[PDB]
Amino acid sequence: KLADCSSKSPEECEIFLVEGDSAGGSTKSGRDSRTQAILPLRGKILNVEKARLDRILNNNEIRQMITAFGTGIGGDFDLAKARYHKIVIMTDADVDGAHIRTLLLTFFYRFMRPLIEAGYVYIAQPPTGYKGLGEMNADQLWETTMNPEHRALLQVKLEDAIEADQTFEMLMGDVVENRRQFIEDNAVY
Amino acid sequence: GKLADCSSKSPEECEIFLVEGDSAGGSTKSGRDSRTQAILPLRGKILNVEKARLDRILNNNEIRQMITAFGTGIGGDFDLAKARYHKIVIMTDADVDGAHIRTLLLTFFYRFMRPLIEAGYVYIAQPPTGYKGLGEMNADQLWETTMNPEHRALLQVKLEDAIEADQTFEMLMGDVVENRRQFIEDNAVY
Amino acid sequence: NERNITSEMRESFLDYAMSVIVARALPDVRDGLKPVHRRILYGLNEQGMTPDKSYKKSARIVGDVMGKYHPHGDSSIYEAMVRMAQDFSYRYPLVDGQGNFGSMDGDGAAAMRYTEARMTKITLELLRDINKDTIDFIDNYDGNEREPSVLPARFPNLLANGASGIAVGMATNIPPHNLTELINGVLSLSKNPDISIAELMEDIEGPDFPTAGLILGKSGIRRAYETGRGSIQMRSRAVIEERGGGRQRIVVTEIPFQVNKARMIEKIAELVRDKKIDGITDLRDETSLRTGVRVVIDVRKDANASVILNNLYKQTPLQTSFGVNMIALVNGRPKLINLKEALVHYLEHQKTVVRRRTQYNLRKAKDRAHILEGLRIALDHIDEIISTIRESDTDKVAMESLQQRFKLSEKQAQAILDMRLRRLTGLERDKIEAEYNELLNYISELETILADEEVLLQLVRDELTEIRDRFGDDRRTEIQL
Amino acid sequence: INERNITSEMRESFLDYAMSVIVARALPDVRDGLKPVHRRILYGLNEQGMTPDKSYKKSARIVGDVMGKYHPHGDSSIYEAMVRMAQDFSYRYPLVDGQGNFGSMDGDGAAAMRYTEARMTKITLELLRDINKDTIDFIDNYDGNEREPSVLPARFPNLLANGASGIAVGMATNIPPHNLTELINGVLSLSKNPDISIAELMEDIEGPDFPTAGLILGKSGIRRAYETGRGSIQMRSRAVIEERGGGRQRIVVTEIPFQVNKARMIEKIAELVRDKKIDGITDLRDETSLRTGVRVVIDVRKDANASVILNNLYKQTPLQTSFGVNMIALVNGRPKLINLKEALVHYLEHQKTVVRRRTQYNLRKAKDRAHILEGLRIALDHIDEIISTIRESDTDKVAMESLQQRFKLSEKQAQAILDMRLRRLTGLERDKIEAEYNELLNYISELETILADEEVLLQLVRDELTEIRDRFGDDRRTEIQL
DNA sequence: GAGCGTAC
DNA sequence: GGCCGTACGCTT
DNA sequence: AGCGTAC
DNA sequence: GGCCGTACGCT
Ligand SMILES: C[C@@H]1CN2c3ccc([N+](=O)[O-])cc3CC3(C(=O)NC(=O)NC3=O)[C@H]2[C@H](C)O1
Ligand SMILES: C[C@@H]1CN2c3ccc([N+](=O)[O-])cc3CC3(C(=O)NC(=O)NC3=O)[C@H]2[C@H](C)O1
Ligand SMILES: [Mn+2]
Ligand SMILES: [Mn+2]
Ligand code: NA
Hints:
Structural class of chain A: alpha/beta
Radius of gyration of chain C: 29 Å
Largest sheet of chain A: 5 strands, mixed
Distance between the termini of chain C: 67 Å
Entry title: 2.5A structure of QPT-1 with S.aureus DNA gyrase and DNA
PDB class: isomerase
Structural class of chain C: alpha+beta
CATH topology of chain A: Rossmann fold
Largest interface: C-D, 34 and 35 residues
Bound molecules: ligand 54Q, manganese (II) ion, sodium ion
CATH architecture of chain A: 3-Layer(aba) Sandwich
Shape of chain A: globular
Oligomer: heterotetramer
Largest sheet of chain C: 4 strands, mixed
Assembly: octameric
Distance between the termini of chain A: 40 Å
Number of domains of chain A: 1
Strand order of the largest sheet of chain A: 2-1-3-4-5
Keywords: type IIA topoisomerase, antibacterial, inhibitor, isomerase
Chains A, B: DNA gyrase subunit B,DNA gyrase subunit B
Number of strands of chain A: 5
Number of strands of chain C: 18
Helix content of chain C: 40-55%
Number of helices of chain C: 17
Strand content of chain C: 15-25%
Strand order of the largest sheet of chain C: 15-10-9-18
Shape of chain C: elongated
């Protein structure tokens, strides 16, 4: 469940999507309550490139985000109703945290594409190292990752839709073999 | 949380084990003779009825779970002939907390199913003494040391006096701390 | 066989009742610790979890404490420890936690696999000298390990951090205090055995909550110190300020000890919602890790904000009493103690601790001296020593020959046989003669302490004053009137 | 610098994950047949002195050490893997010895780790044998604060022995358990014939051997599995038809297929009766008990053909199940689909390397020791001068130098002399050094002989394998029906 | 299918 | 990783 | 009323 | 202590 900033003005308000309920708690105390909201994510989230609409719309996690963004999905997507102008992906500096990142991007791309084109979606950059988010001090999380004075965010940019459409389908797709080929082509071992 | 019943539906040969904790309950179910031994785990300390009110007691799940399981009913509605087991066996850890849980169960029975004790349907198991509790030992040894009739020593609960028994429950489990505290000050061997 | 209902109840209950009492729910008057807390710290000790060394996973620490000393559910252990790390729970925190260890909002710590810990430097003072036979050890539950019955506790921790615990047939509720005031009270007492409470209250004003805030009046305090029981009115630190436009707000920056901030706020929100309190137009928590606790209550314009506040003290935990009940384990039995008794027992414990230390340091300095005398002899007659060994077929034979020829103890002779050849170079020989002389002086230092009751005492004083000077801090809680 | 391309981020991010799961989570190494979580548990059990002789330790302490030192993941994945290794209905050759509730065929859970204890199995020791004789390459742990092995010496063919299942990214792996006797014999046969055919190998290795036992139908599935690495093998329960009284009958089930949950299977049977999908069944009863063993009883209505009802439960329930063999393992840090012989070859070659490396480690070690013994020999013979030399000396350095000058001792030799305790100067002790030195010299030769002949090394591997077979070999549990 | 088994 | 059960006593 | 160790 | 989400491939 969501922790919301006091400010009602979307332009200045940012929602961090945080990995784990440990990291979430630290982030809520650590964050600046005025402008910064927190939606924690309980582990791996549904891969929508493999799921049908019925299931997707029934997913708690997927449902909480839709609700929190308030922009609607698909044709009903109204970028004008976005309750936050910065949507931030905050995950561990491990391969699972990177997996989660790809699970989120697939969704945004497939349901809130205009949200990306508007450059609303960012990627946090926590300390690369041996510590997950749920092991860091809240004060430590704020300065490195969250304080706009010190943090280094990565705005997600979409160069090309066809290339993006093919890649998501290959990477997140139902057919294993093409994914197997991709790995085979690109693995350096 | 969920009772595991036996095969036989004839109460004369049936026994029900009230175990301490779901790890112990799981071990008990494998170890037991499923043909005649039904196990009901209790998850930690249970409601102290002596201190509670009726609406609460009836609503409480643990109390309800056991009434349903015994099949007698309680108070005036009690029917010892409706009993589904002729042996109700208290199986708690060989420690003080297990022994507390014991007094709590006995409080319930003597107060709501009093006829069940007088009938001698109520027993106390006796597993291995020492530091390990029930959830820490294997299912093959829970059976061989506590559940298996050939070797086990159960303790049939009897009551010679009922006025003395009523004062004890009231004194020990009642809501008057001081009579409790005085009893502890008189029998305290530090 | 059979078992009588009356006798099984009496016996079962008492085994339980005595156990919660003397080994779970109540603190020891000497170190102010319960079984679970002591074993954790003793666990940080033996696991080498000192402040200089790095944090360690909380799961690993708790596992150790449960496998070795505390055969109880892991949640019980972890949350006690979590509480020790919380600067809003312990007036003088005992665990140094990394990760999420909770906040005033009543939010819990993260799970033990996500967090790490080690001691705080003041914990070091709790266990200082623990390995100098200063306290009696005991067998653990399975008999595998030895654990401390009590800690050295070189500061008066029962009162510093307080204790709250519900037993059977009884319970305890002891509030935290200011370390400096306490130690001064201790020092005052050591100079006057017949000191009154009143005079002790010259040093110790009252309770000092990690949460700061206000206390109302001295009478509850007074009564609690003289009997061990009394009511203390704790109030929040709240002020009234203009928000501009002729409108004011109430601002709260400190809350009562052991009060959930969040829950208190929902209590207020609820009263406004149900209209049981007039004059409030907004409620916000502005508490930030930077700006500290700050709860705001906007007052409707021209409403009297003082009156509102007054009712807010009447209707919410913005004011809360602390019921002091000071029952602590004394000589292994539960006793209700006044303040002076509390200090008397702590003092006697520091006497015994420093005495036992000084006696232990002695035994061991004489033990080592005896050895060095054995080695010096050898250095003196090294050629003969060699001859004696070389001409021995076996070590035992060499042991006997060495004892007989040079009039050595068995220990002295074993030492010699274990001596490495390099110990014969110039410097290595000087090191032995140098250790010995230093040691002879130490011994006679130690013997002085133990030869005079007052020397000993003053040593204890100095050692306190030192702790007081390093660790003693400012009073947090204001005692109004 | 604020900007990330969505295509590039997705390709990079997904590859890092996929790569990791593949080579460092989901797949077994062809050499010790372990996944990382499993390798670290056993290493930890070893690091902690948790051997069969040693007493059981609480599983929570074990997990914390495994977690904290080698495995930075959830303790649930950890403890659960460890629990599998301790279940005789999971592991054809269990590597963990558990005290407490470790769960059941029905598949209850183990008790939480604070309730249970464990230590190594005697067979596990054989995985760790010689690990400290520089037989395998160690590496840094994640926080770089420790060292863990990259693989175990694995003195038995464990990949095929216990098998593996794991869902990777882009691939999966399914490898069944086998009889160790038949396994080792296979290897022995390979070692004498680098050209042996799979068919020939199958003279030793008949097929899988599940801990749960039961039956297999036909050799064709197995043969395809072994020739190619993939194939469907048909797993039938052990059930017989028997009379119960009144001229009626029952089906009794006593071995179910591998990895099937007994309880879930029973529910499916119950469901079919309820839903009228099957006919002729009047009762269903699990009479399994610890003494009795697995007993599932199906009661058949009189004058109803049981053998027919039986066939229908094979068709309609997990009573008959398929093991889809898909033999993928890490070979050279890369996932490969291997066939039987490939499996056995990467193992054997491991062993040659492990035995060779151990032999070499021993050699350096023994030669080192001798050198020291020589230096000691000299000191005892010239002791009076040696002692004088040290006494004159004002430091270690001075003493060192002089001793090397006058006796042409090496720096390590002299060092050993300066560390010598006086008790070594007794007459008996001199004899003890001499005896030790002599054995060493013999030892050195022996070791040198093994290094000199690859055939001799190979026979050593053969001999060591065979002892394990003799000690741990047991009877084939699964019957194969044609 | 859905469930095998490591992960969040 | 977050829900949630119970016993125990209490401020003159 | 809910503090804090237990199951 | 139990219940429950998710990804991932294969059948
Ligand atoms: C940290 C947990 C707390 N706990 C809980 C927790 C919740 C509930 N509940 O909601 O009914 C019952 C029990 C009772 C509890 C349990 O969940 N199961 C059990 O078998 N015994 C217990 O005491 C106890 C366990 C052992 O330890
Ligand atoms: C052993 C548990 C399994 N687990 C579960 C379990 C259940 C559910 N669920 O019911 O939604 C979600 C998650 C997701 C889960 C969680 O509960 N919380 C969380 O923050 N992250 C997770 O991955 C995970 C945790 C970390 O570990
Ligand atoms: Mn992580
Ligand atoms: Mn117990
Ligand atoms: Na089937």
